[PDB]
Symmetry: C5
Subunit: 336 residues, 5 copies
């Protein structure tokens, strides 16, 4: 009974040329692609790359595979995949990709009577996602994914999505979990590119990422805020206690400096100012400014003490007000 299928499989391979695409010199082959994202890999800001695992599926029509039998479908494995012609799809922006072989090469091959062929593949892609870290950490990123033919121009093989955008790409609820990003949604598109060899069709999918804040607040913002408050305490002290107020000014300035170095260790070495950098500079100014006020006061404490006392008392309320006002502008500007 099983032998009936064996004859059908043998017959199809007879007189079959895997080096020739279906409908060669007759028409234009059409391929339908669908994707399912099992998990979104970590995003490496330093290397401008992001990993992703998907189940890429390609469908096309081949008349040479027509057959008749009791079953309309022939589930199979990767053994027969290399015995026929399959598209040479590749990812243009994929720096490094690898497949999964254990326990068995994760591939499927299904054939219908009319000639429809289904070929699903599991892949891990490490693509490149350029970013503009000008509004860091309040930044939105659009990481793309591009794939297409490598040797068949648009006049021979054309890639088109199947059904609507929602069904075209699917992301698992638990897979879309990142430590410092949110996956708002996905979009798809198509475009043509002109190259030296000819014209080719390109399928593009974009992912929208919204960075989540809260890790940097505990890491960088809060230490800066508390350090500024620490310096202001020196004003409430007495002028004659030169040594006491000296410690406050010196220690606070050095504390801000080390935070600036430590903060950018994880951040990519971008050669331009970021929003976080300006916040540190403003905080550095307040602590540095407080030290200057003490030095100026101590320089004139012997000639005109009347004005010196006013400056010492005035700075108590002036500095906190300015620091509070700056924070409202800073957070509001980047959160709106």
């Amino acid at each position: 009974n099983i032998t009936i299928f064996t004859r059908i499989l043998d017959g199809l391979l007879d007189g079959y040329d895997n080096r020739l695409r279906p409908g060669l010199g007759e028409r234009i082959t059409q391929v339908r692609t669908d994707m399912y994202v099992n998990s979104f890999g970590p995003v490496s800001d330093t290397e401008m790359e992001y990993t992703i695992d998907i189940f890429f599926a390609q469908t096309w029509k081949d008349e040479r595979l027509r057959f008749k039998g009791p079953m309309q479908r022939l589930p199979l494995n990767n053994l027969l995949a290399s015995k026929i012609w399959t598209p040479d799809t590749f990812f243009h922006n994929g720096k490094k990709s690898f497949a999964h072989w254990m326990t068995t090469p994760n591939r499927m091959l299904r054939i219908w009577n009319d000639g429809r062929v289904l070929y699903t593949l599991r892949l891990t892609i490490s693509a490149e996602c350029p970013m503009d870290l000008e509004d860091f950490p309040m930044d939105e990123q659009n990481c793309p994914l591009k794939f297409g033919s490598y040797a068949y121009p648009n006049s021979e093989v054309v890639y088109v999505w199947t059904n609507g955008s929602t069904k075209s790409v699917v992301v698992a609820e638990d897979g879309s979990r990142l430590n410092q990003y949110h996956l708002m949604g996905q979009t798809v598109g198509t475009e043509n590119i002109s190259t030296s060899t000819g014209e080719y069709t390109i399928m593009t999918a974009h992912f929208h990422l919204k960075r989540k804040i809260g890790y940097f607040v505990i890491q960088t913002y809060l230490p800066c805020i508390m350090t500024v408050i620490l310096s202001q305490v020196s004003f409430w002290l007495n002028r004659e206690s030169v040594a006491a107020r000296t410690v406050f000014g010196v220690t606070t300035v050095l504390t801000m400096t080390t935070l600036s170095i430590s903060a950018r260790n994880s951040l990519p070495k971008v050669a331009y100012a970021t929003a976080m950098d300006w916040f540190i500079a403003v905080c550095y100014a307040f602590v540095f400014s407080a030290l200057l006020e003490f030095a100026f006061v101590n320089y004139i404490t012997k000639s005109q003490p009347a004005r010196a006392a006013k400056i010492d008392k005035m700075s108590r309320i002036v500095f906190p007000i300015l620091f509070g006002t700056f924070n409202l502008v800073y957070w509001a500007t980047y959160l709106n």
Copy 2:
């Protein structure tokens, strides 16, 4: 004499199609799976992955392999494994897996007269274990492991455990050793999933992990506790010694800040508060609060010394009591 076995092996391969599962178009194939964990690999909290080494064994029934001879069993090696049909089992959550080839590919193939087939394989799996580090370090994790068919729907191939749960999965006494976790036990389960291609059966195994405390106590908790005690010593000093008490307040505050940065270097960059973070914040408040008390006292030491002395003496007993009370609540809450 040995030639008798050679003929039997040759006969089975004759007229055998490795591309067709046993009982195709006749019934539903049944597969029994058992696992043995030789060693549980390190758990990477940063990457949310854990490594594991296992001896995966699959058993099924094939009528085409029936044979008769003096021996009821035919021990073999990986050479004959690729000459017949084997299931395309894969791990759904396996990011990266590799096999062992030295000295020889670690695989076995045994055949019985009735047609029973045994196929054991050795694998190293690097799966993903999402975690909710809200009660860190007093947290319990449930790392799963999923595997199933890739091309055969539930209507063709079904996976079921053999015997009870205890025999289904076994973990070595010495293998289940981790630097920062305890392996309390294991559990198994089964479920069905509906996908675009059809319905498939999924076999799931869960591991219960209980993080062991003691490394963080020496690393983070104790330095914070001692630092708080250090600040309280400043109260016993005299008010006029402004410079002396200034050093205590300034140094202690900076000491807590550096610990907060260092502590989270190893921890994953989670964008939410943890139990350990609150403990540091409370400790930071005490040291910061002590500095404020000294500044307030020194500001009124010239007008109303009577109340200033009471505050200085009152803070000696008040602060230790509150700090001790907080610890009992903190540890009791997360240890019950």
Copy 3:
């Protein structure tokens, strides 16, 4: 209809020796090469290596592949690439190179009636780029790329660029993006090398890199500048406040020392002075010099206070002027 192409392909392979180059013992084979750089990889100063991804294309003429048919071109895939003779091109300076295999080996093979053959390949090259970091960070680098034949001397196979330099090598607008470099332009050249085995032709392409400044300014220059300003404040203080001015001198000197160690952590361990190193040394001298001035003043404050006051007041204006003058010379010299 499709069978016509099948016969043509079979005919060419008949009586074809892939071990013999076209025109063996008759003339000298000529090969034309073109390159397209999709993305320029990160430059590792520590390892003196840079990664690059390209689409290498080679063209040559073979009379044995002449054919006649309705189509003048025969698009194909990597399947037929190994059935014929292809050049053994290799990169002389390539420490480690790998190809891309997913989804399919990214290769193309096209044949014309006259015998022209096109063979494009996708590669990732990790070459070596020696650098002279004497004017760091104001330095320009010239990273080369060399390739040629490995077994065919110049008398047999010759490599020559096609068309002008602009068409020979192309770099993508978005691909040429680096965190700490600018890609000004590219150049090409040819040369001959004499070796033990004979004479060979070498094709060389040079890339001009202009390091972008701005990351080191925030990282190293600014902390040094502010630290110097901090020390100068000690002059405005009073001499009798020995402890107060002592803190300024001690803290500033240590601050510069740690920056020197931290700054060179990322930089390669070059055993010679750099421009940045001299800047730190000059800044270290000012802070160290200020401490010496205070010690000298305090040593003679009991014998001849008249001259001590003049030095204290004189240093207020003298030091800032010298520091400002030095910066203009330093920046102008390396920016012109």
Copy 4:
């Protein structure tokens, strides 16, 4: 003349089944194993793994390979290794192993007239060595190495060492060099294991490692010892110099804290106390205790100075004696 050997080699392969072990269904095969360690790889305490390079050799007897000719031995290469039956030996505790292929696969195959077969292989093994770091750094480790059959039970294939223990395993004089360990000696043993599939024979080799001290003395012990001495100097100072003695106490306590964090960075994250940890805690107590003594003295310096002076002078001799006494007990206990 050479053709005589060619016929012999062809004859043996004729009618040879590589899937059947020698003496199948007749007797029990016996295998002799010998090892030579060229170099002992670094021991990773963090990952509890150690690398090793060996020349594994296996010998067995096969009657089917009997031959007659002028030469009693037939040196060969890896080409003929896969044409016959070889044992499926594997390492039970080997997490990851790889072979050497350049210039040629490092394997040998020799055959004698009686049927004796020699098969040597070169391997690199990354095994796991669990450790009990309770007496760290004065700890002794016993890293094992296990190998055996994967599919042939004890009733078919048995592994036994050849000759005495000394000849069984050999370690190169220069290979046994480690940065933080000493290789005292080696031992061998045999045991049987009962599993689900049956009974198997296991060959075990143990290596005795004696950690060498001297790196931690310069790294951790000495800084702690000097820091304790630094605090004692504060006693010789005068009580009225509150600020001076305050600096000694504050700085010393923080210095010990940072050493504790830095010291354990390299050490594995073991969740239990070690001998080194207790030493730091004792040193921390002395420096912390000294600060308490000063605070207590300064609190009563106004009421009863008579007793305050005695405590200040008494602590000068008391503290050094206790610290010296503790060291003798600590070192003697762990060095005996």
Copy 5:
């Protein structure tokens, strides 16, 4: 015309046994080896390994390959390399080696009428170079490289260099560039080794490395020298300024301690004293000694001020002289 070569190639392969060395059972095969080093890889002191890239060439004589034709030479590629017998050369000390495959496996095969065969190969070798870091950083290293046969004893295959030593090994002018080493020269040698399997010939090449100083001077020596000078300034201060001189002593001692920890982070964890370590210890003594002098002076400043002043003034000139004298001895001893 080309067909003439095809027949010659086919004829040689006919009746050719790749499993038998030329002149088997007749004489002893002789092999000539030459090497060319394109680039010397980085030397990893921590792992005691060094990478190297070479073009290894082997030559031998085979009578079975004699042929007659118009051309005396037959350039070829790697395709025919595996069709004949080649030596199983391997590197004894090579921990891990890999070849280059892109664009084509970098191998050559040339044959002459007399039977001379040339076989060149490109390899990357990561060998092991044990070092004795007793005079670090003024140390000279001799990194060897060993290769030989794996299965052919000395009685069958013998390796000998060709021509003089200079032609035997060649190093590129630009390739021999290291960040912290100088390649003075190279040497070659031969030796025999007796093993269990028999006697084998070993070819050895030694490289002489001279570490370049200048990176450690900026990194470790200079900070130590300046720190010592800083402590001496405290002597010029007045005794009554107890707090001022206290800061100098405390800060300097801690500064030296951190440098010792940081300095050895890059250095391998060698368990013995190095020359650099002694320099730090001597520098630590001076700064520590200065603090003791101040404490002793302050202890007797009330009883016998006459002697206290002499010590304070005496130490001003005594300490600089001793420090300068020590440097001359230290540098002269290790630089001669």
